[PDB]
Amino acid sequence: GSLTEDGLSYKEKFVVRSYEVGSNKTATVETIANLLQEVGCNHAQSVGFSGFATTTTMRKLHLIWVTARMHIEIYKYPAWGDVVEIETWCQSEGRIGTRRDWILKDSVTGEVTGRATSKWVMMNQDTRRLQKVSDDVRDEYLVFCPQEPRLAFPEENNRSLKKIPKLEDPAQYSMIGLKPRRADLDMNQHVNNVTYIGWVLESIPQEIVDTHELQVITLDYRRECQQDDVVDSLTTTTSNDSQFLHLLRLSGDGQEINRGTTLWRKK
Amino acid sequence: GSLTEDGLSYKEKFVVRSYEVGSNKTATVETIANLLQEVGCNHAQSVGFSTDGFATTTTMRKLHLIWVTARMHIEIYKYPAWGDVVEIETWCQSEGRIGTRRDWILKDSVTGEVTGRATSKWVMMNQDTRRLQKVSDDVRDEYLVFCPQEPRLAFPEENNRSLKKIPKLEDPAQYSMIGLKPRRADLDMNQHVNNVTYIGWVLESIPQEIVDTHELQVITLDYRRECQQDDVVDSLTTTTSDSQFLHLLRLSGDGQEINRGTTLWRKK
Numbered sequence A: 001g002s003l004t005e006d007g008l009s010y011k012e013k014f015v016v017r018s019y020e021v022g023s024n025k026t027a028t029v030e031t032i033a034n035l036l037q038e039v040g041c042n043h044a045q046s047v048g049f050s051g052f053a054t055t056t057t058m059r060k061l062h063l064i065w066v067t068a069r070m071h072i073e074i075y076k077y078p079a080w081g082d083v084v085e086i087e088t089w090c091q092s093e094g095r096i097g098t099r100r101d102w103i104l105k106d107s108v109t110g111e112v113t114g115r116a117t118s119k120w121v122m123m124n125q126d127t128r129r130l131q132k133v134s135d136d137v138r139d140e141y142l143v144f145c146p147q148e149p150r151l152a153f154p155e156e157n158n159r160s161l162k163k164i165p166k167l168e169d170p171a172q173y174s175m176i177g178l179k180p181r182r183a184d185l186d187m188n189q190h191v192n193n194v195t196y197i198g199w200v201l202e203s204i205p206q207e208i209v210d211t212h213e214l215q216v217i218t219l220d221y222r223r224e225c226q227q228d229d230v231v232d233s234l235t236t237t238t239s240n241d242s243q244f245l246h247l248l249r250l251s252g253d254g255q256e257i258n259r260g261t262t263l264w265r266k267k
Numbered sequence B: 001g002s003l004t005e006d007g008l009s010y011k012e013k014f015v016v017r018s019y020e021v022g023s024n025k026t027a028t029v030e031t032i033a034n035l036l037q038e039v040g041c042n043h044a045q046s047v048g049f050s051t052d053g054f055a056t057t058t059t060m061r062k063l064h065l066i067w068v069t070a071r072m073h074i075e076i077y078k079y080p081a082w083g084d085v086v087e088i089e090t091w092c093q094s095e096g097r098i099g100t101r102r103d104w105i106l107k108d109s110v111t112g113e114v115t116g117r118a119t120s121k122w123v124m125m126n127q128d129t130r131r132l133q134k135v136s137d138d139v140r141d142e143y144l145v146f147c148p149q150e151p152r153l154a155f156p157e158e159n160n161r162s163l164k165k166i167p168k169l170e171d172p173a174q175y176s177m178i179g180l181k182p183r184r185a186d187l188d189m190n191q192h193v194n195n196v197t198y199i200g201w202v203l204e205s206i207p208q209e210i211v212d213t214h215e216l217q218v219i220t221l222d223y224r225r226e227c228q229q230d231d232v233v234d235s236l237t238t239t240t241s242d243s244q245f246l247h248l249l250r251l252s253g254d255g256q257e258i259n260r261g262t263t264l265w266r267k268k
């Protein structure tokens, strides 16, 4: 992997592994999400950042970046043995937070096979209190972002910015008692963001997965699942194409941890 | 990755990823086990097998036969750090009619030093009836040309840990993790639970304080029966001692054994 010529974006190639693919012999959306995370971490390391990606001022103030939303659109899932090239960049969104975008390409054809965007907010590591980005923090990372707008999702009222409603009981489908194991944790012992994507997908019936391809997934992150928490995954059909509304909540008290939507195309 | 000069082994380099490491910023034993599988699959593809979901010969496909893991044994001296490059070499050997063995050697790409080693036993099974069998001469002739003829063992030492008999854990277990269920990410391309998931489930019943203060040195795992996608598992562990543990995975309902194993840990 390497920063591009202008030093404002980062590119990396990956060979799709045998254990990374599903029944169709193509990468799962969770393998894609892991690759997006890996290339994001390699971009942060290349420009001088570090268990968390933080600036000097962020470390002094016990501040970290946390994902608020992840949005992924896949046109073609790379096959086992295929090489996928991923380009990533970040942009400041004023005082609200930051955005990281990605473009996925087939290395042989040069064709765009997917795109993704994510919203990140600043949080105090200890109190969990969200906050706006300060000028002092903003000055430390603006030199690594393009100054002119560069968007993976330029479209007028595109799906990546759509408000997601709260699923109403009773859900059409559910998967109950989901618990993270050690492999679900990151190096800081927090549940990996990609685990939540897997849990959302667990309540989609196997017949939809066997006859459809996942085209778009939008996921909001409201609260973290702790290592000793238990989750229930809920799904209701809202719709050639099938659309679903999703909700992850704690098994006991029903506290919301995530909400999302998925769009699927008939194979 | 590539076959070596003589065409009797295969080598591949891997850069350890951010999501592949634990609290110590080094690869987990499950990341290592996944890499061992990946290099094994790439070795099979390079010599003309697979491109269907299973590594099979022409005669195996005609007879609906597949290779299934009977035992996995891994010994790690140093876990590669995040960003480090690990080189893995693998090869296979026929063990007569019993089955086959695949071995691995792990090395730090910068120093050339051996950082780990692994060995696995594989048996032939009819994929529809699940009935185990010996390896026929016709099947053995199709894969013997891809194996070294003289013995080449990752674990040569007489009566080494990789060949030790593992006893069955007696109730009550000292520790347990109950109600473990596979999700879609735990499945392989044939919708079977990935062998590495069972390693993760075994490790789930080890208390977090042992993991925080010890490094896993050796793990031996026997595979007795597969966990189906709709099955639920209980992971049981008892200290037998360095720290040593005896492990047992069984179905949550009827208590049918799916795996048994042992782990050896060194105080950090």
Ligand SMILES: OC1CN(C(c2ccccc2)c2ccccc2)C1
Residues within 6 Å of the ligand: A043, A044, A047, A049, A053, A054, A055, A058, A065, A090, A098, A099, A100, A120, A141, A144, A145
């Ligand atoms: O997910 C978003 C991408 N942002 C980082 C980032 C920004 C520009 C280039 C590389 C990396 C970051 C900003 C400020 C402190 C530490 C890391 C956070």
Ligand SMILES: OC1CN(C(c2ccccc2)c2ccccc2)C1
Residues within 6 Å of the ligand: B040, B043, B044, B047, B049, B055, B056, B057, B067, B092, B100, B101, B102, B122, B143, B146, B147
């Ligand atoms: O996991 C064990 C090792 N595998 C062998 C094997 C694979 C398919 C058919 C016959 C034999 C082997 C693979 C690649 C080179 C040489 C032998 C099955």
